[PDB]
Amino acid sequence: ALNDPKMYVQTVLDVHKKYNALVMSAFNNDAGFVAALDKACGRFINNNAVTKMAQSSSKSPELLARYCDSLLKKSSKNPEEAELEDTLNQVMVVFKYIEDKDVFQKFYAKMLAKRLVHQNSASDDAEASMISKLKQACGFEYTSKLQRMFQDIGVSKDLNEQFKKHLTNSEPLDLDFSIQVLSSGSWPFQQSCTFALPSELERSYQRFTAFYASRHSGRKLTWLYQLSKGELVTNCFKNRYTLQASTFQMAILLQYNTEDAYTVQQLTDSTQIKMDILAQVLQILLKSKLLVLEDENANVDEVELKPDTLIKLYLGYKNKKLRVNINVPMRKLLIQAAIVRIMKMRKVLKHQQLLGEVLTQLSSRFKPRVPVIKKCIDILIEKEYLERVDGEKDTYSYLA
Amino acid sequence: NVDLENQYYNSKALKEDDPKAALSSFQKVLELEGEKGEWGFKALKQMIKINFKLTNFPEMMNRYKQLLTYIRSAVTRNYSEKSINSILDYISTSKQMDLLQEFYETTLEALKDAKNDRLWFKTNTKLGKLYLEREEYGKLQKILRQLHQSCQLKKGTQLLEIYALEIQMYTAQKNNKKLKALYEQSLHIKSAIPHPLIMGVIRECGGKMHLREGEFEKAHTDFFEAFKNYDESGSPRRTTCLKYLVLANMLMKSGINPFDSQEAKPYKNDPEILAMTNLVSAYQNNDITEFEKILKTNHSNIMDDPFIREHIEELLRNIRTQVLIKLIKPYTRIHIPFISKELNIDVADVESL
Amino acid sequence: MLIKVKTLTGKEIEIDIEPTDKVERIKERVEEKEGIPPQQQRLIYSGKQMNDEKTAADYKILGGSVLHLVLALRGG
Amino acid sequence: KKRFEVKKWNAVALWAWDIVVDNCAICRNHIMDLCIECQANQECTVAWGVCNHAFHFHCISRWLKTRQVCPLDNREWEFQKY
Amino acid sequence: KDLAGKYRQILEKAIQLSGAEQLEALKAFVEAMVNENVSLVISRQLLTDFCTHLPNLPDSTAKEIYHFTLEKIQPRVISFEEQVASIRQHLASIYEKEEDWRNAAQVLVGIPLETGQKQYNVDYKLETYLKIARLYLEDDDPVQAEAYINRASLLQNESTNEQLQIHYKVCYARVLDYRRKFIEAAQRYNELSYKTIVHESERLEALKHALHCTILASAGQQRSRMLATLFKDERCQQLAAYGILEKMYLDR
Ligand SMILES: CC(C)n1nc(C(F)F)cc1C(=O)Nc1ccc([C@H]2[C@@H](O)CCCc3cncn32)c(-c2ccccc2)c1
Ligand SMILES: [Zn+2]
Ligand SMILES: [Zn+2]
Ligand SMILES: [Zn+2]
């Protein structure tokens, strides 16, 4: 199951459905048959045995998120939107049975980010349907991050087509420029690695910022060059090569515009890339045999990548593959006590009214953050502590 | 196989502006393509981009029947719809009534038989926007009724798109009775993820119907939401809900400067909303002398549209009331003519107030 | 061995235990004596509140130590 | 005519507000002051909502005593990120 | 190959010229550096060396070259985003040395500190914002100094420079005093007078400014309690306005 959990998930789906049909025929709601159902699914499925000695326990309940990712990810011939919906419908029913739904929204949000920003998402219309279904489960606050991620994808799509119209009124760009503006505070991505923009891509850069100054006022742009790709062609080789590479590989290849060979130190100094990231980029470039060094007999494994080796562009590049693509991926217990203490005096309190009375009354030490207090109050009301009102507004009450 | 990998790059990277040569090579691609590959559509799109300019319409009717079939299964939904938008948008201003009329008739019937769920829904909505912008409200209703009658919840995204189209059409019809019903209908939908342009028409007419009725607080919430969504997507209409945002904020007994949030601060000094910025800066910290001067100077920027002229009577009276209340605070006996000189109104009007 | 617990008012109860007995056992014995729930009751020795996980190893008296019982509301 | 030409570049950005915050719209003092009330008696800290609107803790606390909405957007005010 | 040897010799000699012929040499040579044909290894690096030698040349001549260079870097700013910061900072010093606050403030304003790909450190942004507010204050423009003192307020909380926080508080009190908020500025000045880090000479200056602001403040509950605190201070007798403070405290 650990090696190939793909078919492990499919086993659970088939077993559950057939159990209901057999009972209603002759058993007539037998006491013994119904009782044995709740004991088998809980212990055997929710937490399996091999999660203990394999030092991997958090990943076990998280294999459901990747299953739904595979259905909405760009792949080969996929099932049509006629039989897939009904299988997803019963998935919602079993989802409420799990208690740690918070981690579900985290992993699905991170996986959705990589699917959308890289244009690897399939059936984008169906993606809105999937997120809409998750909204009904808990609320818009539960899917607050997810909805914003999908919204800015549509905004950027209309922004690019509006940018094309703006290009006709000015000098046409020598390259096709498309950009996902994304958003700050709603995405897992963040700028971490500094980068020197190549002189070829600067002008378009500036152009776009102008388009983002007239359209939007008081808005910055934190470009993520590690998440940007592009297509680069060669006009001096024997054959035309339209390679697809990230911004880092693009800059490394474009550095050979003026010369033929460079050392690692000059590459590091000119592009200001960190040692580890640049080492990984150089290694994956060497895997594609795009750049070679003087000594073929030298082994890259037992010889450290010292920042002095002179790598030269291989002018007789005749690699047998015409489809080169180097763009492949490389305990506190204080807040619960405070909550019960503040609910002692006031029998009935709103959720947000209770927040602040505990969130920031003791904020001078151990700033608690909203989600921690939400989770603690959830595990409290679960264990016969708050027993919130049956639906009248959002009062949480006490022993009522 | 081996030749498919090599030939496609040669015919794509090399633009081959010379005609009567690249046509033959691309023709062999479609017939020889046996596998269920995506590369067939990409080369097939090139002839539409280049050879469409050089007439050759009789050639295209023969090739159009099999063109739509590849959308279903050869490529994904996102790629098929993306290629359509670029070509169709720029030919709208190119006139060609003889092309636009006959193309839509034959395409709509063929696509209806195959796709009904989502691909047909968006294309028909796009055509509905075309009817809306052409000021032709005689054939939008027929396609709107068939769009609306698809349910009889779980389809909130599609329902809100229809409601936005109805609201936009009735705005041009000068209809107010239907606007109330449409806005309340959208309130029952709580599971929609629409574009931030769809929820800028529903949330703008909701603020306007609240403005007319007299609920200035609910209008402020609707105008803030509409302005925020118009800021994310859109531009020309964004600096129209901001003016109504400030006016609604002045009609809720003031309080809190609208130009303090991060969304409205950059547009505070914009020339279009500069007059309203000074209006709210004078409404708060009540001073009638400055408030009246701004109204007199910016007569063609404030007292122009009926949505602000009508409510200018409610203003210039609340600010006068607040000045009056503060003025009479430290007095046990005051002169009515003395009040009139401070309020800049007649003695008879002071007694009525 | 056989200790005495006194409340604030001065009421004395004599409860018998073993050296390996836990403080939860003390609270349960007081419950069987009067009826006080263990969570609504606090035990003090030498002016320091007992922790709820230690089996009376440093509370060795061998002569009936005097314990202090304080009523408190559930969870403070 | 150029020796080497770039054909495509799919960039990715991350827009953010140029000015993070410059005022608390309940006391008109910016978010690093004491909310006037803490100025008289010496604490004051920031508070955010789901609308990402920042106010002083004390200001929004006394605003929530009688109301239940965000002062700026007039929406349901829920505390977020302390 | 020929670029490294020949062009290095010609650049090092041409910088030493006599008179007006120097300007003509820089016009054609700088334009050759802006050209796209020059890679960003012999243009970005040597521009820093070119700029560090400029302050030695007289300030009167340095103004014209500094302005001309900024115009030529404008088409390609993102590449030379670090030279612009140093060039404009150097030019602001020359403008302030000529008792020209408006020009110095505008030059420092043009530096991209938020809308830029170079992430300047908190200390750099804090000290630049304080200088801009101070220069605007010297131009009798409280509105502009208020705007740039708000930005510096968001960086002083997390800055590790203890001295820079004192500088920010001094400028903040001056801005409040300029904005005719005397009662609020008096309290800020009073806090500064109680800091042992600040020198005694300026400590009395802060006390003098606090007393002047309290006297100029509007009469009321807050002003009366500030007067009592100042009178109870034993260092107020050294100020030339102690006699007025005594009468004002006694409600005379
Ligand atoms: C005698 C003590 C130790 N005590 N024994 C037992 C019992 F469980 F054993 C229980 C207790 C005990 O401290 N109770 C208590 C309960 C409530 C309050 C506050 C509370 O409501 C908060 C609102 C104000 C209030 C008005 N009237 C009671 N209060 C207090 C209390 C009163 C003054 C100062 C501090 C605390 C004590
Ligand atoms: Zn405040
Ligand atoms: Zn405060
Ligand atoms: Zn808000």
Q: Are residues A151 and A257 in the same domain?
A: no
Alpha-carbon gap, residue E133 to E156, rounded angstroms: 15
- Beta strands C66-71 and C2-7, pairing class: parallel
Check the annotation: does D27 bind a ligand: yes
Q: Which helix (H) or strand (E) holds A87?
A: helix A84-95
User: Taken in order A341, A344, A350, A351, is the CA torsion positive or negative?
Assistant: positive
The total of other beta-carbon atoms located within 10 Å of residue A144's CB is: 15
CB A261 within 8 A of CB A313: yes
Chains B and E touch, contact meaning at least 3 pairs of CB atoms under 8 angstroms apart: no
Pair A345, A380 in one domain: yes
Q: Checking phi first, is residue C17 left (phi over 0); if not, alpha (psi -120 to 50) or beta?
A: beta
Q: Are A311 and A331 in contact (CB under 8 A)?
A: no
Which resolution, in Å, applies to this structure? 3.0
Q: What is the DSSP letter of D49?
A: B
Other C-beta atoms closer than 10 Å to the C-beta of A214 total 9
Q: Is B260 helix (H, G, I), strand (E, B) or coil?
A: helix
Provide the β-strand partners of residue D12.
A180
Left, alpha or beta for B14 (phi > 0: left; psi -120 to 50: alpha)? beta
Structure tokens, B88: 């169709």
d(CA B72, CA B135) in angstroms, rounded, equals: 33
Structure solved via? cryo-EM
Q: What six digits make up the tokens of B246? A: 């400030």
Q: CA-to-CA distance for B280 and B270, rounded, in angstroms?
A: 14
Instruction: Answer yes or no: are the C-beta atoms of E105 and E134 closer than 8 Å.
Output: no
Range of the structural domain that residue C38 is part of: 2-70
Which two structure tokens, joined as six digits, stand for B171? 């705005």
Ligand 4 centroid vs B190 CA: distance in angstroms?
20
State the DSSP code for A24.
Answer: I
CA E107 – CA B208 distance, rounded (Å): 46
B351 C-alpha to center of ligand 2: Å?
39
What are the tokens at B270?
């914009």
Cα end-to-end span (Å), chain C: 31
Distance from CA of A1 to the nearest CA of C (A): 40
Secondary structure of residue C43 in the 3-state scheme: strand
Tell me if C75 is assigned to some domain: no
- How far is residue B204 from each of residues A308, B129, B209, B253, E75, measured CA to CA in Å? 64, 18, 9, 21, 42
Quote the tokens at residue B121.
């829904």
Amino acid at D23: N
Ligand 1: atom nearest CA of C40 is 8
Provide the CB-side half-sphere exposure for A377 (13 A, CA). Answer: 28
E10 to chain D, any CB pair closer than 8 A? The answer is: no
As a whole number of angstroms, the distance between CA C71 and CA C41 comes to: 5
Q: Residue D7 carries which DSSP code?
A: E
Contact across the interface for D32 and E154, Cβ inside 8 Å: yes
Q: Which domain holds residue A163?
A: 57-171
Q: Which domains does chain D have, with CATH numbers?
A: 1-82 (3.30.40.10)
Domain annotation covers residue C76: no
Neighbours of E219 (CB within 10 A): 10
Number of alpha carbons in the 13 Å side-chain half-sphere of residue A364: 4
- Distance between CA E121 and CA E159 in Å, rounded? 9
Pocket test for ligand 1, best of A340, A345, A349 (most atoms within 8 A of CB): A345
Sign of the dihedral through C-alpha A254, A260, A265, A270? negative
How buried is A198 (Cβ within 10 angstroms: 0-12 exposed, 13-18 middle, 19+ buried)? buried
Helix (H, G, I), strand (E, B) or coil at C13: strand
The CATH number linked to C11 is 3.10.20.90
In the structure encoding, which two tokens stand for residue B314, read together?
Answer: 């409610």
Cβ contacts of E101 within 8 Å, gap of 6 or more = E95, E135, E136, E138, E139
DSSP A51: G
Residue with tokens 């709601």: A29
Same domain, A62 and A167: yes
Q: Please tell me which of the candidates A233, A242, A363 has its beta carbon nearest to residue D45.
A: A363
**Residue A219 DSSP symbol:** B
3-class SS string, chain E: CHHHHHHHHHHHHHCCCCCCHHHHHHHHHHHHHHCCCCCCCCCHHHHHHHHHCHHHCCHHHHHHHHHHHHHHHCCCCCCCHHHHHHHHHHHHHHHHHCCCHHHHHHHHHCCCCCCCCCCCCHHHHHHHHHHHHHHHHHCCCHHHHHHHHHHHHHHHCCCCCHHHHHHHHHHHHHHHHHCCCHHHHHHHHHHHHCCCCCCHHHHHHHHHHHHHHHHHCCCCHHHHHHHHHHHHCHHHHHCCCHHHHHHHHCCC
Q: Tell me how far the alpha carbon of residue A259 is from its chain's centroid.
A: 39
D56 is in an annotated binding site: yes
Q: Which residues in chain A have Cβ-Cβ distances shorter than 8 Å to B85?
A: 161
Cα gap E16→A302, rounded to integer Å: 52
Closest CA to E223 of E195, E168, E186, E176: E186
Q: Show Cβ contacts of residue D47 under 8 Å, excluding neighbours closer than 6 positions.
A: A356, A360, D54, D55, D56, D57, D60, D79, D82
CA nearest neighbour of A332 among A392, A289, A375, A270: A375
Contact assessment for residue B209 and residue B179, using Cβ atoms and an 8 Å cutoff: yes
Q: Identify all chain E residues contacting D31, using CB atoms and an 8 Å cutoff.
A: 154
Asked if E244 is an interface residue toward chain A (Cβ–Cβ < 8 A), one would say no
Together in a domain, A179 and A167? no
In whole angstroms, give the CA distance from residue B110 to residue B121.
Answer: 14
Count of helices and strands (H, E) across chain C: 1, 5
Query: Looking at residue B200, what DSSP letter applies?
Result: G
* Domain count within chain C: 1
CB contact at 8 A, B327 and B342: yes
Query: CB–CB of A234 and D81 under 8 A?
Result: no
Quickly tell me which residue has 């030339």 as its tokens.
Answer: E240
D58 chain-A contacts, CB cut-off 8 A = none
Q: What does the alpha-carbon distance between residue A90 and residue B186 come to, in Å, rounded to a whole number?
A: 28
Start-to-end CA span in chain A (Å) = 46
Q: Of B63, B158, B72, B51, nearest to B106 (Cα)?
A: B63
Does the annotation place D30 within a ligand binding site? no
According to DSSP, residue A243 is labeled: E
Q: How far, CA to CA in Å, does E134 sit from each of D56, E97, E167, E175?
A: 28, 14, 11, 9
- Cα–Cα distance list, A162 to A155, A208, A215, A294, B161 (Å): 11, 11, 10, 49, 21
D43 is written with which tokens? 């604490």
CA distance A285 to A249: 8
Helix (H) or strand (E) holding B114: helix B97-114
Give the closest-approach CA distance of C74 to chain A in angstroms: 9
Residues of D in contact with E156 (CB under 8 A): 32
Helix and strand numbers, DSSP H then E, in chain D: 2, 3
How near does any CA of chain A get to the CA of C38, in Å?
17
Report d(CA A175, CA B139) in Å as an integer.
42
Q: Are A360 and A267 in the same domain? A: no
Pick from E150, E156, E187: CB nearest D22: E150
**Integer CA distances (angstroms), B211 to A344, B180, B218, B314, in order:** 44, 12, 9, 12
Which residues surround ligand 1 with Cβ inside 6 Å? A 345; C 71-73
DSSP three-state, residue B46: helix
Strands A229-234 and A261-263, bridge-based pairing: unpaired
How many whole angstroms from its chain centre is CA A14? 29
- For chain B, the first-to-last Cα distance in angstroms comes to 89
